[PDB]
Amino acid sequence: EISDLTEGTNAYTTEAMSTATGLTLSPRETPQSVSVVTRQQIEDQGLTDTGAILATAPGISVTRSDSNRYSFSARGFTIDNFQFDGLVSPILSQWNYGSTDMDAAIYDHVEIVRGATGLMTGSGNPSAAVNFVRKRPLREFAATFNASVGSWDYVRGDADISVPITEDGRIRSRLVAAYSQGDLDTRRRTFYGVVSADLTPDTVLTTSVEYQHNHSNGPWARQDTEATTYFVDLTHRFTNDWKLRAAYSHTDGRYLMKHVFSNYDGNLDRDDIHFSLSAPFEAFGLRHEVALGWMSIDNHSDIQRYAMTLSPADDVRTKQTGAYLVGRFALAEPLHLIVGDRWSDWKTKQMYFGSRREYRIKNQFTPYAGLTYDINDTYTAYASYTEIFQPQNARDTSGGILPPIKSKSYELGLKAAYLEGRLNTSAALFQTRQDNLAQVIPGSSIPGFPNMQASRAASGAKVEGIDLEASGQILPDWNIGASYTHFTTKDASGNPINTNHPRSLFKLYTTYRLPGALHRLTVGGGVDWQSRMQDSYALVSLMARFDFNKKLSATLNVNNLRNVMLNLRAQY
């Protein structure tokens, strides 16, 4: 049904996600490779921030490019965007400001969509969309606390409290706070407070503030990151079930780095806006739905470097808008067609010492076509086509801006939802190509116009491979999340190209509550096995949980690559 909510289900799968199309669909009804990392998965595996949550997800690897730990990757490409409650924030280089380090306590789950995701994303790489969905207030009082200890003097505590503001819960609040310390010493403080008010039985106003401070030290380094996000959304359902949603976010970010002699001072400001109108309806005896929407992503970061890469000052301003229409149409009872259009505008204004990178791209069209066929109670087959574009700083022989890189993604597949959707499964074949990749024109330039060197649009890399997943409950007391991905990268004319990214990945994590006299004990563990086809890395891990009673448990995690974490959970 509805509810992307995974807290309290004890499940490794979900009923519903909305990241791929904006529409709230079950996994089996989404004609793309999609995953969840549920509340339960996060707690079983002791995942403490957004980066650690993403690292465990199907099809994701941490790729190293030049030293180690550099990027998150999927399908041959860097993940250059994150979403929080569906609002995109760029994350590479000066855009991060803690996005990959946000405390996990804030989030109910993360929704993943692999391949091109331009419909809802805008500009980006055909790797994955990654959407962290924040906890929302409950209608009644609830409290959860965690206290952890671990290797290298690691300590962590968090608190999660829902307080109704009126008795009925018409006005409701929720507060999350976390702290951690460790080592190379680092510490993290996080606060998140949210209030929702039913202005009518059909109108919800939500407001929230999110805050994180990350400090690290140890030539003595010293690095501080601080970020505050103000968020607001308004929802209204008309008596015809048409729905209006308006969302706004504003983020202030502060970065500060010392060395030995070297000083880095960065500021970030970011505004995100999203409006939508959706509408369910019947036509030709069948049920359909349509959504129209508009989003804006406006990013400003500035950096000053002082020393007594090399630039003394950068100011980068990137503004993007997209207008979309999405429909899901039943051509028959078992057979759905998803069609989307997005028109996007994108511009950048970048200032450096001695220069100025400034350009806009012509209005971009991004299509989406997905087809799903319910074979029986269990199985659904699907095929999809979609795109994502990536602006590039490359110019004509005339001096004009090149079209953006255009990623073109084809996928077919088979899904199964066993035991009423308790166990979800997926097997997909994917093919992506990049067209209009800037190619530096021989040794000929055209920098009488400005600067140095010109390009033409050429064909780029091709990726093809397979994407397999199984997540949910095999038997009562037995949870699993398992996935396998393999892909091949080639150039436009068809010979292999080397990449840093792993081409084969296998992941499995399983828990099992013991059957009888041992029923207070759950044991589990897993493997994260990536391979560049050359070498191999395997994270092997183990856990045990003891349920003292219904409201109090201890969890032990061991990870290898030892690393040992012990957690107590207490709830009201």
Automatic annotation (TrEMBL):
Membrane topology: Multi-pass membrane protein
UniProt key word Glycoprotein: no
Compartments, as annotated in UniProt: Cell outer membrane
All copies of domain TonB-dependent receptor-like beta-barrel, residue ranges: 197-561
TonB-dependent receptor plug domain location: 27-127
One record GO biological process: siderophore transport
GO cellular component terms listed in the entry, alphabetical order: cell outer membrane
Protein name as it appears in the record: Ferric alcaligin siderophore receptor
Presence of the UniProt keyword Ion transport in the record: yes
Sequence similarity: Belongs to the TonB-dependent receptor family.
PROSITE patterns xref list: TONB_DEPENDENT_REC_3 (PS52016)
Superkingdom of this protein's organism: Bacteria
Single GO MF descriptor: siderophore uptake transmembrane transporter activity
Alphabetic keyword roster: Cell outer membrane, Ion transport, Iron, Iron transport, Membrane, Receptor, Signal, TonB box, Transmembrane, Transmembrane beta strand, Transport
